[PDB]
Write an enzyme that holds these catalytic residues in place. Structure first.
Site, PDB file in Angstrom:
ATOM      1  N   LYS A  66      27.913  30.927  53.055  1.00  0.00           N
ATOM      2  CA  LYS A  66      27.197  31.798  52.116  1.00  0.00           C
ATOM      3  C   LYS A  66      26.145  30.996  51.339  1.00  0.00           C
ATOM      4  CE  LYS A  66      27.980  35.253  48.557  1.00  0.00           C
ATOM      5  NZ  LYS A  66      28.989  36.078  47.867  1.00  0.00           N
ATOM      6  N   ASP A 119      30.965  36.503  36.104  1.00  0.00           N
ATOM      7  CA  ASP A 119      31.581  36.173  37.386  1.00  0.00           C
ATOM      8  C   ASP A 119      31.880  34.676  37.503  1.00  0.00           C
ATOM      9  OD1 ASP A 119      32.191  35.799  40.153  1.00  0.00           O
ATOM     10  OD2 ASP A 119      30.627  37.151  40.877  1.00  0.00           O
ATOM     11  N   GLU A 166      26.720  42.364  44.068  1.00  0.00           N
ATOM     12  CA  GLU A 166      28.071  42.112  43.560  1.00  0.00           C
ATOM     13  C   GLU A 166      28.254  42.650  42.128  1.00  0.00           C
ATOM     14  OE1 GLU A 166      28.840  37.921  44.355  1.00  0.00           O
ATOM     15  OE2 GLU A 166      28.402  38.306  46.482  1.00  0.00           O
ATOM     16  N   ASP A 185      33.922  42.152  50.267  1.00  0.00           N
ATOM     17  CA  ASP A 185      33.284  41.187  49.390  1.00  0.00           C
ATOM     18  C   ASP A 185      33.283  39.906  50.194  1.00  0.00           C
ATOM     19  OD1 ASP A 185      32.598  39.227  47.522  1.00  0.00           O
ATOM     20  OD2 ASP A 185      34.395  39.460  46.335  1.00  0.00           O
TER      21      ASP A 185
END
Ligand SMILES: OC[C@H]1C[C@@H](Nc2ncnc3ccccc23)[C@H](O)[C@@H]1O
Lengths: 115, 380
Positions: free
Chosen positions: B71, B199, B175, B10
């Protein structure tokens, strides 16, 4: 609480503080070695352009020393000591004050070089 | 070293996690410092390059040359609104290389620029080494996760980061799909299953609505807040304490960075304690001007200071349901992902909204995405 009531549980907290005292003694030695290097650069034969680099390398080291002292304060700040643990509370206060006096010395170096 | 198994990684904005399926279960792998998650941080010093815990542990000492949040840049054009907004916040330089962003740092006395996929490849290399250190075998194959809203350019840039790191990227998966796989939501018997993945971790908030029919995952909608997390909850606690110190001592500690840091560090720890206790105490000797600060906070006060932020998390839920053309009674499963979903008030708001519906939270939220990526890695 009562006097002369030393408990085995306070022995645990005092052991944690003693380890932190030792770590502060080691970081303090680094500070003293940085001071000797500072005097060395000032009393040496490095020209302006070369002393500039030498003081900045020293600045990085001073910053590492300040950070290590800050990580010790954070560690101490995890402690919760009952009002009855008088000996631990006195040792915690003396250690924090000792670290703050070393931080003031680091700031004396840090502000005087590489800027 | 002999041939090792396939891993699930991840790759997160602020932290990364690697897992391996062995002996019938997923094992989340601890790094060299014994941590189950590793900071997505790369630091460029005068003499070396640091990755992970070693990079974050010197952020205060070297802010301009310690990169994180790659990211948020990966697969984007320089002129992208996200890049332009994010840049003001970062202490490191972001330059324009013919329309593409590059992080500009000082490395070994030289000014050097790196692409976001190069930075992520260094983070991926570390994740690979962590797995090789534990298994004692060479690791080449990996399933790498990406957010569901990632476009073609962002997906390919993530695959390229894998390739540069020497990994054979078996599959790139969403994800929320990884989180659904971790709970076996594709293995449930019946008609098409509507799943909500909530999330709240690593400084981002992402809500995704999925439809699983005959093993096919379908992203119906995505919603959220790009800058929302645990840091904001901590900031509200810091404000509360700074105000308390002004009331009790008539002294403002807010311009002493070290006093604020000691307070902020203690608050983050207290916040964690409030997830399983209704009270947390803090003792800080000589905080400011020789003053000792001994105090406490209840769970109820912590919830009040964050009421707008916690309630706010349901707007994305409403937006995602409306975009997916689904009523809340049509959701069969709710999955919690990210460390901040451990907050009892957050779970209560989400359960109350879904009319007492039980949440999938048995797998550590910080680990659920790498967990599902490791399950997928074993299947391939
Ligand atoms: O790393 C990203 C977020 C996650 C947050 N973790 C937590 N936030 C809240 N309660 C927690 C309880 C137990 C363990 C972790 C908890 C942590 O403080 C940080 O702000």
């Amino acid at each position: 609480g009562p006097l002369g009531s030393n408990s085995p549980q306070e022995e645990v907290e005092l052991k944690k503080l003693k380890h932190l005292e030792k770590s502060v003694e080691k970081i303090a030695d680094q500070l003293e070695e940085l001071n000797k290097e500072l005097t060395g650069i000032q009393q040496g034969f490095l020209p302006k352009d070369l002393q500039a680099e030498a003081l900045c390398k020293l600045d990085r080291r001073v910053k590492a020393t300040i950070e290590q002292f800050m990580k010790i304060l954070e560690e101490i700040d995890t402690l919760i000591l009952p009002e009855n643990f008088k000996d631990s509370r006195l040792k915690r206060k003396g250690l924090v004050k000792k670290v703050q006096a070393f931080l003031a010395e680091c700031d004396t170096v840090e502000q005087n070089i590489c800027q | 070293m002999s041939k090792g198994p396939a891993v699930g990684i991840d790759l997160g904005t602020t932290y990364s996690c690697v897992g391996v399926f062995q002996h019938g279960k997923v094992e989340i792998i601890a790094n060299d410092q014994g941590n189950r998650t590793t900071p997505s941080y790369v630091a460029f010093t005068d003499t070396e390059r640091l990755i992970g815990d070693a990079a974050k542990n010197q952020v205060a000492m070297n802010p301009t040359n310690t990169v994180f949040d790659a990211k948020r840049l990966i697969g984007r054009r320089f002129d992208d609104a996200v890049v332009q907004s994010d840049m003001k916040h970062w202490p490191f330089m972001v330059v324009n290389d013919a329309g593409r962003p590059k992080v500009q740092v000082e490395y070994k006395g030289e000014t050097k620029s790196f692409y976001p996929e190069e930075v992520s490849s260094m983070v991926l290399t570390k994740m690979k080494e962590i797995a090789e250190a534990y298994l004692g075998k060479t690791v080449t194959n990996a399933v790498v996760t990406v957010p569901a809203y990632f476009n073609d350019s962002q997906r390919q840039a993530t695959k390229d980061a894998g390739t540069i790191a020497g990994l054979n990227v078996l599959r790139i998966i969403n994800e929320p799909t990884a989180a659904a796989i971790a709970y076996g939501l594709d293995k449930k018997v019946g008609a098409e299953r509507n799943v909500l993945i909530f999330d709240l971790g690593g400084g981002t908030f992402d809500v995704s609505i999925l439809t699983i029919e005959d093993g096919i995952f379908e992203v119906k909608s995505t919603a959220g807040d790009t800058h929302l997390g645990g840091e904001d909850f901590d900031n509200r606690m810091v404000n509360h304490f700074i105000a308390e110190f002004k009331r009790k001592h008539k002294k403002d500690i807010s311009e002493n960075k070290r006093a604020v840091r000691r307070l902020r560090t203690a608050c983050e720890r207290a916040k964690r304690t409030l997830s399983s206790s209704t009270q947390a105490s803090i003792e800080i000797d000589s905080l400011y001007e020789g003053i000792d600060f001994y105090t406490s906070i209840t769970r109820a006060r912590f919830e009040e200071l964050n009421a707008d932020l916690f309630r706010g998390t349901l707007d994305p839920v409403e937006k995602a349901l409306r975009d997916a053309k689904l009523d809340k009674s049509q959701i069969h499963d709710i999955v919690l992902v990210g460390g901040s979903t451990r907050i009892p008030k957050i779970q209560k708001l989400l359960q109350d909204f879904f009319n007492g519906k039980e949440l999938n939270k048995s797998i550590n939220p910080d680990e659920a995405v790498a967990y599902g990526a490791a399950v997928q890695a074993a299947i391939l």
